[PDB]
Scaffold this active site. Structure first.
Site, PDB file in Angstrom:
ATOM      1  N   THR A  59      34.417  27.663  34.679  1.00 50.40           N
ATOM      2  CA  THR A  59      34.263  26.808  33.511  1.00 50.40           C
ATOM      3  C   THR A  59      34.096  27.632  32.238  1.00 50.40           C
ATOM      4  O   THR A  59      33.794  28.821  32.293  1.00 50.40           O
ATOM      5  CB  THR A  59      33.049  25.873  33.657  1.00 50.40           C
ATOM      6  OG1 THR A  59      32.970  25.010  32.515  1.00 50.40           O
ATOM      7  CG2 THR A  59      31.765  26.678  33.765  1.00 50.40           C
ATOM      8  N   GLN A  60      34.294  26.990  31.092  1.00 52.42           N
ATOM      9  CA  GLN A  60      34.155  27.660  29.806  1.00 52.42           C
ATOM     10  C   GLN A  60      32.719  27.560  29.310  1.00 52.42           C
ATOM     11  O   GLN A  60      32.186  28.503  28.731  1.00 52.42           O
ATOM     12  CB  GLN A  60      35.115  27.061  28.776  1.00 52.42           C
ATOM     13  CG  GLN A  60      36.556  27.517  28.927  1.00 52.42           C
ATOM     14  CD  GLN A  60      36.703  29.027  28.867  1.00 52.42           C
ATOM     15  OE1 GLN A  60      35.886  29.719  28.259  1.00 52.42           O
ATOM     16  NE2 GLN A  60      37.748  29.544  29.499  1.00 52.42           N
ATOM     17  N   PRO A 119      37.037  31.286  34.379  1.00 51.18           N
ATOM     18  CA  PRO A 119      36.097  31.931  35.297  1.00 51.18           C
ATOM     19  C   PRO A 119      35.071  31.001  35.925  1.00 51.18           C
ATOM     20  O   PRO A 119      34.772  29.933  35.400  1.00 51.18           O
ATOM     21  CB  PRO A 119      35.377  32.924  34.389  1.00 51.18           C
ATOM     22  CG  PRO A 119      35.361  32.245  33.065  1.00 51.18           C
ATOM     23  CD  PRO A 119      36.668  31.510  32.971  1.00 51.18           C
ATOM     24  N   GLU A 149      36.312  19.834  32.087  1.00 50.41           N
ATOM     25  CA  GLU A 149      36.593  20.217  30.708  1.00 50.41           C
ATOM     26  C   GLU A 149      36.901  19.007  29.821  1.00 50.41           C
ATOM     27  O   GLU A 149      36.583  19.005  28.629  1.00 50.41           O
ATOM     28  CB  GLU A 149      37.714  21.248  30.667  1.00 50.41           C
ATOM     29  CG  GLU A 149      37.393  22.524  31.415  1.00 50.41           C
ATOM     30  CD  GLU A 149      35.936  22.953  31.525  1.00 50.41           C
ATOM     31  OE1 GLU A 149      35.119  22.551  30.660  1.00 50.41           O
ATOM     32  OE2 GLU A 149      35.622  23.688  32.483  1.00 50.41           O
TER      33      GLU A 149
END
Lengths: 214, 235, 232, 212, 239, 202, 200, 231, 234
Positions: free
Chosen positions: A1-2, A105, F92
């Site tokens: 995840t970011q 990542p 996301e």
């Protein structure tokens, strides 16, 4: 995840005469708030391997379910070939690096502890794919607060006993509680020897607040 | 030329290519499955066609999952590919729903995958039958059998292969409902010895597998001690 | 997509499809080619001599570029496809490389395409033979001949079509260094070879020429009638 | 999210008449902390080829595995081991494959050539490379290079004998420059691993450096 | 899959494509389509096959189709196949006009469709289009033109040509009646009526379209019932 | 948004607010944030209204098809596993914090929390939404083990009310739900029924 | 980097420096900036070391394949066009390479300048690199088409030497080449320090 | 009728077997390996006198150190020859060194059985190549002569003959061949044998010859050079 | 007749003729022998040279440091499978940093070779393999074929006239476990001699040997190195 959501703090790991011991508190933080106070951050891969993880908890659960299915697939063949701790550490490194190369990542810093063929293994795998082995590991804030203490003891006493390692790991947890604001006072302790993996806890450290008066 | 393709019905409404694949299962060694009061017992009369082969080679019993066993008969190459397919379904299921796949659903999924190779001429029907057995604390003991066409039913006692018609009779006598896995092991071992042809076939090895309450719901091969203890009682 | 193998080997090592494609070339019109000193002649026998037909739209002698031209024999529809591909390749060669393509270069490209259709799935081989003629940068007269199989050869004088065996035989004992002395004897040679196979020789023989550093010229009904009378 | 990290390290290469030396420190760091004091940066490729990798440790590990696999594939299809020059040429193309997301590694290949002479090839992150007599890469690359130019190439020296570099003398120099590099570079320390490549296989040594 | 395949795009022992040859036999039974090129225009004369008392008129033409501003065509053979080709012809002309901002020349349009018909006899494993076409049009390069393609992708320019049922008898009657260079529209129309009467005639059994130039503008129009009727009567006077 | 789910012997007790705001304007003041996934499986929704509605719809479609093929009542953990999968896979894009709660014959009354990241943790009681921050100390000092179905209904209503009074994004009415082996017991607490707490005055 | 090439009456003269720089630190003082594509073709490099090296090597491979297919050597115009079409696909991606393709084909001595930007121009005197501005001055001031071979060497050498004296990213040694009808030949390789004592 | 990947009752693929029968119709090619180098020779089989003998190329240069003589369907050989050329050029680009003769042959032998109808795209071979190859170059192991056929099977030989008269030529190679021959002796014997299995009077424009010595590169004998060897 | 053209056509007897036709290629190839002990696994192939001037074709290939194979049947097909075996072995070393267990690699080959036998148009790999490896479970000897079935044996032999070699192995398959290296390699050479005709014998030009043991990586012996093992036989 970011952007990591619910994350866990540092994970301690030390090798001793005939095994590896890994400790980690049972707290999942959401920013600066302690949301989930009873989650396990240590897992048992197989009879000789155990894994501890810090960082994004959701990413750890995904890795825990993927790793778990790999062990089941390997045990389904029954051919006398099981994954060693070094092979699990190798697989993790490749998985962590592959995800980092695609700019997506798995926000985790893992500690791999194992015991195979009379040799204790202690591996470290970060989110960038940086992997290495050492006598004692510490992730997150443990590298600045627990590593110094662990390294000092392994300089005079390179080989420790089960009791020595266990009590040295409890001294590190006590210091982490005192100085890390993202930590909890309830941790778990996993030990791996020839008999297998053993997860102990929920344990607590004994703190002292004599400096409040002075 | 009505039997050259699986996407062709014959004049009397029959798919000959699917019936030819079931003829290959009748040339294989007999495999039997018996579900007792707390588990399932598998037994195959593995025919050793060479002395150069290692004891245990070409095993006809697999582990599709921790709680599921699979006894096959027919084309080993085809059976192995079906075992891989069953391992995927069970693995995928756990990733999706978060728990062990029920045996009935596993049988359904694999049987439907086997039925897909009996519709077109682009492929050929599988030439191997197999039994699926598993034990759960809440589900109990289950034993299914899928044939080349894709039909899968639940059973109490089942047999597939060369002498499956003769091995079935010797299975009805036993009262598996009130029996136990430990006692059924010998029963199954004796059944396989009676139906084994020693005048036409050569030598064979006894393959025994079981899953139930005694193995804590985990499928595994019958231990040497028990295997040899049942091998002497059946002799 | 259609991916069935059309051209396959036979018991005695023969590619039937390629041999059947070569049979179509024998039923086609005759096309002879002669390589002279400073001139190149391409003659074709107009089988259909219909008076109600527009002759400009059924020509067999085309142009691939400013220095390369060609004639064919066999399936007319296939030739067009090949000619259009060769034309596109010529402009591609003038783009990447800063110079005109050589006669052998485009012959090699046309032959490469023909061979590909004999070893590809879901497609039959081309049923035509080409007689590529032209001049290189140095000013050398080239004459190549490709066939359905994909094999090309450089010749001095060649004929393809129905009466190619006869023309070739006749050309063998007529094509010398004195028979192509000028730009008129070469033209009289091509017309001579065509006249011994073409029914009612004269108005059923189209022929174009190409001299060094010069576009392509197609002799008309009057120009060719003077050469046919000269012979007599 | 940044996909790179500076883990320090410094690789040194020296070519001789009949030998080759590839040395490096064993410290792996991140930010201002020390990961491990026992991490050699020298990897044995073949029996006469040794590679040194410094920079992003994550890339160092992956690149090292890719090279190893490529050497095995080349031996499978060519029935012979890869030469130092061929490995250097192959590495150049491997580094240029990721031209738009390059490896953060400073490679240095030190081995023997076909004539048995010491060969040293220094590399640049995107693949640019060339053969040299000696080379230094990493955090202390600008600290050691000047000394080697002076002590090995005799630059800026007048009346000097220009005596051939010997294994014995080369060993002393390597240890000396690394001792000086540990005093000024904060990324270099712990231990020094030396890999001597001669005609009789590869030999390994280890010298302790400053711990702080 | 390899047993049901009829192999439509493969050569035969004598070097001939059977599918194409069989498709040309289907065009030999269809309605007669004739074309005659004059000095001041070009015309198309197709014999109507859709003849019935209960058949409605609806469309402006049954066998003659307008491709673009200056081009019209006549199909023969499989009518359903002709519908695919005529639609492709219009799309080819519109594409050329969107690229060069000018009308597409007659020969370039015919060549584009002949390349599509050639592709169905070489690869794909599909049957060819069993339709022969006749193109009439005017361009700024060659003025009035008359083309004719076939199932194999072959095509040629003519002065006067006929396709479809009894196209052999029409061609032979056109050679002895056509005047190279000295043919007028009026005289061309008379020749068309004498050719359709020989290879057969009522005014409902035929369809006539002419293509002429008027004030730098192409004009295509189908002759009306009365318009044709008179022509038919004038040929009866000479018979 | 404030959602809460507590479990007892029989089953569970779900509750939430009904305010849907866009900045400082209340678009919907009587929103139903408690969506039924199956007969005994519900889910509270917080975060993005379109994200959580699309996720709840997908899960409901999958769980029902899965329940028909198995010919059995779906487990609560399976519904949580399906929510978790979607929320992790599209972490996301989606901005949803789902609380899944229900009852099944194999495990009884279970509450699963599936927060923004896409992790999945079982709790005896859970709270989510923007208004949950104000009631962490109250649910910690007030919750005891051994609560009955009626005690869970009061405890949930008290907590939601305390959060609604302090949070600008919470308000409206309280929608409770009791799930048991029997079925579902839906109930709304309007204006005067909403538990009140005096304001410190001087 | 400083590379220069000019074609006089006796072929083409190609000179360059040998300095590589990584920021402000001198990475090398012996780098090869001239690539021998084949016996009659030369290529210079300037800008991105890895870029130039890689694409020039790819160009060399294409030239070799071209000669095997048509049984003849590729021309200088065709070779430079191949390199121009090659790097045009990655236009704007960041590629940094300025090269000079020199040789002798059917049209005599050919000199082409090709960069990553998209330029491909033919000429008689070019100069690429950061020290190219300084080389131009000296080159143009003493350049003549009737220049003798020995005079052409001194000109090219002096031009490069003056560029290394002014440009901080230029230095090392001057490597000189000479392209003729028989092929290119490595003329000399003089260090800049030795040239300094000769020019003073 | 059957598919292209159909096995026969013996155990051989029909298609491959049929492609081996097409190699026994082409002109004869002879390869001889010595310590001084490898020599390749092949009859041109000129059909008509009007055709240019130089247009016919049965011997091609794969690389500077590798030559290649073919037989059978010449048009099929062009596809393989180009692959060999690119393969050696790729090797040079990647490893900065030449490719061995064995490596090249193996790389070209991988395309032999790469054909089939079903489960394949548009750019796939429908049938096998009907041509045999004779690779002769010089690497680290000195002169080498490999032979590749339609089945993708390649070997190493001292003297191999391919083509219509390979059977007859083979016998003559076994009689007049030892492991100490010189390059000039290899060439002479090659022409002699080639001159007995021919129909036309072997001249300087009727045949092709090429050698690959350890020193110089692949060289194709010129008319004068061939005429002086015929003496 | 009508049931022997495609692999997707079951015959009325429950057999697939095409698959059995691919097994005929294995029997038309040169014989190969693979036997093992408690610490070593060896392979002995009889390289055959059709032409008198041609060189004997290779039969033993390299797969990895602990795995070696001996082909029999189609050469192209053998190289096709060998390339796949090498790929899988390289994958395991890259991902898990350890040697791929021989049994696991053999199962992978079985899966890949089965797919072709069930699809229309495709054909079975016409090559018989003799895998010799050594992992954590000691030395192994596996035998694969065109029907995608593989067997774990103590000793095996495939190729033309290998029934005599097979029969010889059975008579001595009791002293192989204790057999030492040279003794183990003599038994394989002796077993390979049976397949050969009475006239000719096993020289150093027609015999290849692959050996793999505990501390011994898969090595191959050509002509000069085969002498040592050869010299000693009767």
């Amino acid at each position: 995840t970011q952007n990591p959501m619910v994350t866990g703090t540092s994970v301690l790991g030390v090798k001793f005469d005939g095994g590896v011991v890994i400790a980690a508190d049972m707290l999942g933080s959401y920013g600066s708030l302690a949301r989930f106070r009873n989650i396990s951050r240590i897992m048992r891969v197989n009879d000789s391997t155990m894994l501890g993880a810090s960082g994004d908890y959701a990413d750890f659960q995904y890795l825990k379910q993927v790793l778990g299915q790999m062990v089941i697939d390997e045990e389904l063949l029954g051919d006398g070939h099981s994954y060693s701790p070094r092979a699990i550490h190798s697989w993790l490194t490749r998985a962590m690096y592959s995800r980092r190369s695609k700019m997506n990542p798995l926000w985790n810093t893992m500690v791999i502890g194992g015991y195979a063929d009379g040799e204790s293994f202690l591996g470290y795998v970060d989110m960038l794919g940086v992997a290495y082995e050492a006598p004692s590991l510490a992730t997150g804030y443990g590298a600045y607060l627990a590593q110094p203490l662990l390294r000092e003891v392994l300089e005079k006493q390179p080989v420790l006993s089960q009791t020595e390692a266990r009590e040295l790991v409890e001294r590190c947890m006590r210091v982490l509680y005192y100085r890390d604001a993202r930590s909890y006072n309830r941790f778990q302790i996993a030990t791996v020897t020839e008999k297998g993996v053993e997860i102990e806890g929920p344990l607590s450290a004994q703190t002292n607040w004599d400096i409040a008066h002075m | 030329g009505y039997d050259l393709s699986a996407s062709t019905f014959s004049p009397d409404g029959r798919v000959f290519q699917v019936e030819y694949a079931m003829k290959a299962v009748e040339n294989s060694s007999t495999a039997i499955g018996i579900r007792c009061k707390d588990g399932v017992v598998f037994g195959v009369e593995k025919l050793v066609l060479s002395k150069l082969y290692e004891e245990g080679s070409n095993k006809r019993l697999f582990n599709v999952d921790r709680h599921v066993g699979m006894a096959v008969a027919g084309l080993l190459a085809d059976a192995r590919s079906l075992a891989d397919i069953a391992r995927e379904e069970a693995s995928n299921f756990r990733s999706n729903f978060g728990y062990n796949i029920p045996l009935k659903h596993l049988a359904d999924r694999v049987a439907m995958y086997v039925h897909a190779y009996t519709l077109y001429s682009a492929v050929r029907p599988f030439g191997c039958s197999f039994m699926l057995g598993s034990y759960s604390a809440n589900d109990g003991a289950q034993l299914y059998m899928i044939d080349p066409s894709g039909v899968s039913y639940g059973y109490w006692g089942c047999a597939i292969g060369k002498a499956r018609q003769a091995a079935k009779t010797e299975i009805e006598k036993l009262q598996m409902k009130e029996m136990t896995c430990r006692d059924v092991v010998k029963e199954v071992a004796k059944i396989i010895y009676i139906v084994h042809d020693e005048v036409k076939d050569k030598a064979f090895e006894l393959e025994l597998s079981w899953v139930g309450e005694l193995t804590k719901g985990r499928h595994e091969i019958v231990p040497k001690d028990i295997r040899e203890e049942a091998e002497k009682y059946a002799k | 997509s259609y991916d069935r193998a059309i051209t396959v080997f036979s018991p005695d090592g023969h590619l039937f499809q390629v041999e059947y494609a070569q049979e179509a070339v024998k039923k086609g019109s005759t096309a002879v080619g002669v390589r002279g000193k400073d001139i190149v002649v391409l003659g074709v026998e107009k089988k259909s001599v219909a008076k109600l037909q527009d002759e400009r739209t059924v020509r067999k002698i085309c142009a691939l570029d400013d220095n390369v031209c060609m004639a064919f024999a066999g399936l007319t529809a296939d030739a067009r496809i090949v000619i259009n591909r060769a034309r596109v390749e010529c402009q591609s060669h003038r783009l990447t490389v800063e110079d005109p393509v050589t006669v052998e270069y485009i012959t090699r490209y046309i032959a490469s395409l023909k061979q590909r259709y004999t070893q590809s799935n879901g497609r039959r081989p081309f049923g035509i033979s080409a007689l590529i003629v032209g001049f290189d940068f140095d000013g050398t007269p080239r004459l190549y001949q490709t066939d359905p199989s994909g094999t090309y050869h450089a010749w001095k004088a060649n004929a393809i079509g129905r009466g190619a065996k006869s023309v070739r035989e006749f050309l063998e004992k007529n094509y010398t260094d004195d028979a192509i002395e000028t730009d008129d004897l070469t033209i009289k040679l091509v017309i001579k070879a065509l006249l011994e196979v073409v029914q009612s020789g004269g108005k059923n023989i189209e022929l174009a020429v190409m001299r060094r550093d010069q576009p392509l010229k197609i002799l008309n009904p009057e120009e060719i009638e003077k050469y046919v009378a000269e012979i007599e | 999210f940044s996909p790179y990290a500076f883990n320090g390290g410094t690789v040194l290469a020296i070519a001789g008449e009949d030998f080759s030396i590839v040395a490096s420190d064993t410290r792996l760091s991140e930010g201002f902390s020390i990961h491990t004091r026992d991490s050699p940066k020298c990897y044995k490729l073949t029996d006469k080829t040794v590679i040194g990798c410094s920079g992003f440790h994550g890339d160092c590990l992956t690149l090292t595995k890719i090279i190893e696999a490529r050497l095995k594939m080349y031996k499978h299809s060519n029935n012979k081991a890869m030469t130092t020059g061929a490995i250097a040429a192959m590495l150049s193309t491997i580094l240029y494959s990721r031209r738009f997301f390059p490896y953060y590694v400073y490679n240095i290949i030190g081995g023997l050539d076909e004539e048995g002479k010491g060969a040293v090839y220094s590399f640049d992150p995107v693949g640019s490379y060339q053969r040299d007599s000696f080379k230094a890469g990493g955090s202390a690359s600008a600290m050691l290079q000047p000394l080697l130019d002076n002590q090995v190439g005799f630059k800026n020296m007048q009346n000097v004998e220009h005596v051939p570099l010997t294994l014995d003398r080369a060993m002393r120099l390597v240890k000396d420059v690394f001792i000086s590099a540990a005093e000024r570079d904060v990324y270099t320390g712990d231990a020094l691993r030396i890999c001597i490549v001669t005609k009789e296989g590869i030999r390994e040594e280890t010298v302790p450096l400053r711990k702080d | 899959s390899r047993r049901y395949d009829s192999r439509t795009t493969i050569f035969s022992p004598e070097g001939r494509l059977y599918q194409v040859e069989y498709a040309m036999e289907a065009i030999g039974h269809a309605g007669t389509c004739l074309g005659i090129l004059a000095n001041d225009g070009v015309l198309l004369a197709a014999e109507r096959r859709n003849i019935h008392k209960l058949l409605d008129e609806v469309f402006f033409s049954e066998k003659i189709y307008k491709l673009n501003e200056d081009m019209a065509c006549s199909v023969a053979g499989i009518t359903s196949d002709a519908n695919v080709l005529t639609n492709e012809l219009r799309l080819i002309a519109q594409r050329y006009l969107l690229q060069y901002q000018e009308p597409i020349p007659c020969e370039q349009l015919v060549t584009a469709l002949c390349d599509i018909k050639q592709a169905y006899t070489q690869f794909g494993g599909k049957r060819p289009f069993g339709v022969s076409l006749l193109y009439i049009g005017w361009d700024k390069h060659y003025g009035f033109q008359l083309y004719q393609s076939d199932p194999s992708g072959n095509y040629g320019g003519w002065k006067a040509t006929c396709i479809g049922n009894n196209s052999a008898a029409a061609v032979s009657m056109l050679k002895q009646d056509y005047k190279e260079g000295e043919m007028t529209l009026k005289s061309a129309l008379a020749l068309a009526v004498k050719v359709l009467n020989k290879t057969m005639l009522s005014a409902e059994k035929v369809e006539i379209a002419t293509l002429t130039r008027e004030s730098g503008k192409t004009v295509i129009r189908v002759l009306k019932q009365k318009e044709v009727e008179q022509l038919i009567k004038k040929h009866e006077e000479e018979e | 948004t404030t959602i809460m789910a507590v479990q007892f012997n029989g089953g569970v007790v779900l509750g939430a607010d009904s305010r849907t705001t866009t900045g400082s304007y209340i678009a919907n003041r009587v929103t139903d944030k408690l969506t039924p996934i199956h007969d005994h499986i519900f889910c509270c929704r917080s975060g993005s209204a379109a994200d959580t509605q699309a996720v709840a719809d997908a899960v409901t479609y999958q769980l029902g098809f899965h329940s028909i093929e198995l010919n059995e009542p779906p487990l609560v953990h399976t519904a949580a596993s399906l929510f978790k999968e979607m929320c992790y896979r599209y972490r996301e894009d989606l901005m949803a914090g789902i609380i899944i709660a229900g009852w099944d014959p194999q495990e009884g009354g279970q509450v699963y929390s599936v927060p923004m990241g896409g992790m999945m943790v079982r709790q005896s009681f859970a709270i989510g939404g923007s208004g949950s921050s104000y009631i962490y100390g109250y649910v910690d000092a007030t919750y005891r083990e051994g609560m009955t179905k009626d005690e869970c209904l009061q405890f949930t209503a008290n907590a939601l009310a305390l959060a609604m009074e302090r949070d600008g994004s919470s308000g409206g009415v309280i929608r409770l739900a009791a799930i048991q082996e029997s079925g579902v017991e839906r109930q709304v607490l309007l204006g005067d029924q909403i538990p009140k707490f005096t304001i410190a005055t001087l | 980097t400083t590379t220069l090439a000019f074609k006089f009456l006796h072929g083409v003269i190609v000179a360059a420096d040998s300095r590589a720089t990584a920021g402000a630190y001198i990475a090398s003082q012996t780098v090869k900036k001239v690539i021998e594509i084949n016996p009659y073709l030369l290529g210079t490099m300037a800008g991105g070391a890895a870029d130039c090296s890689f694409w020039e090597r790819l160009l060399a491979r294409q030239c070799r394949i071209y000669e095997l297919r048509n049984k003849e050597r590729i021309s200088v115009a065709a070779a430079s066009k191949l390199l121009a079409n090659m790097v045009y696909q990655y236009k704007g991606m960041g590629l940094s390479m300025g090269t000079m393709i020199c040789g002798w084909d059917k049209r005599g001595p050919g000199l082409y300048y090709v960069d990553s930007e998209g330029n491909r121009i033919s000429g008689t005197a070019f100069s690429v690199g950061s020290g190219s501005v300084y080389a131009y001055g000296v080159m143009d001031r003493g350049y003549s088409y009737d220049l003798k071979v020995e005079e052409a060497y001194d000109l090219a050498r002096r031009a490069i030497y003056q560029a290394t004296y002014r440009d901080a990213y230029s230095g090392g040694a001057v490597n000189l080449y000479h392209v003729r009808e028989d092929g290119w030949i490595r003329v000399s390789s003089d260090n800049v320090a030795d040239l300094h004592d000769k020019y003073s | 009728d059957r598919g292209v990947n159909t096995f026969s009752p013996e155990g051989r693929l029909f298609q491959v077997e049929y492609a081996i029968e097409a190699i026994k119709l082409g002109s004869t090619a002879i390869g001889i390996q010595t310590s001084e180098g490898v020599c390749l020779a092949v009859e041109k089989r000129i059909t008509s006198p009007l055709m240019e003998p130089s247009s016919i190329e049965k011997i091609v240069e794969i690389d500077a150190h590798i030559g290649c003589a073919m037989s059978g369907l010449i048009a099929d050989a062009k596809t393989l020859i180009d692959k060999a050329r690119v393969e050696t050029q790729n090797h040079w680009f990647t490893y900065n060194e030449t490719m061995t003769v064995e490596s090249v042959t193996q790389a070209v032998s991988n395309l032999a059985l790469q054909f089939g109808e079903e489960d394949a795209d548009p750019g796939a071979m429908s049938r096998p190549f009907g041509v045999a190859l004779l690779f002769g170059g010089v690497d680290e192991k000195g002169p080498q002569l490999f032979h590749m056929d339609p089945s993708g099977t390649f070997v190493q030989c001292d003297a191999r003959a391919i083509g219509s008269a390979s059977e007859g030529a083979q016998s003559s190679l076994q009689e007049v061949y030892h492991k100490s021959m010189t390059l000039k002796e290899a060439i002479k014997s090659s022409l002699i044998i080639l001159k007995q299995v021919m129909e036309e009077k072997l001249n300087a424009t009727n045949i092709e010859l090429a050698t690959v010595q350890p020193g110089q590169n692949f060289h194709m004998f010129t008319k004068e050079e061939l005429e002086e060897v015929i003496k | 007749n009508q049931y022997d053209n495609d692999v997707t056509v079951w015959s009325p007897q429950g057999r697939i003729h095409q698959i059995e036709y691919a097994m005929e290629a294995v029997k038309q190839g040169s014989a190969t022998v693979g036997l093992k002990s408690k610490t070593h696994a060896v392979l002995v192939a009889l390289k055959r040279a059709q032409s008198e001037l041609a060189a004997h074709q290779k039969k033993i290939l390299h797969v990895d440091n602990h795995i070696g194979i001996s082909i029999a049947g189609l050469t192209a097909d053998a190289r096709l499978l060998c390339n796949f075996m090498r790929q899988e072995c390289l994958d395991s070393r890259f991902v898990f940093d350890r040697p791929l267990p021989v049994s696991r690699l053999v199962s992978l080959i079985g899966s890949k070779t089965q797919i072709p036998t069930q699809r229309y148009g495709r054909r079975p790999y016409g090559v018989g393999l003799l895998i010799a490896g050594y992992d954590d479970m000691g030395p192994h000897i596996f035998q694969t074929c065109p029907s995608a079935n593989y067997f774990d044996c103590r000793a095996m032999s495939i190729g033309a006239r290998s029934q005599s070699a097979r029969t010889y192995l059975e008579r001595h398959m009791s002293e192989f476990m204790e057999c030492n290296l040279d003794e183990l390699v003599k038994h394989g050479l002796r077993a390979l001699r049976e397949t050969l005709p009475a006239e000719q014998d096993l020289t150093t030009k027609n015999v290849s040997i692959g050996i793999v043991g505990k501390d011994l990586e898969f090595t191959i012996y050509d002509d000069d190195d085969v002498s040592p093992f050869l010299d000693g036989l009767e």
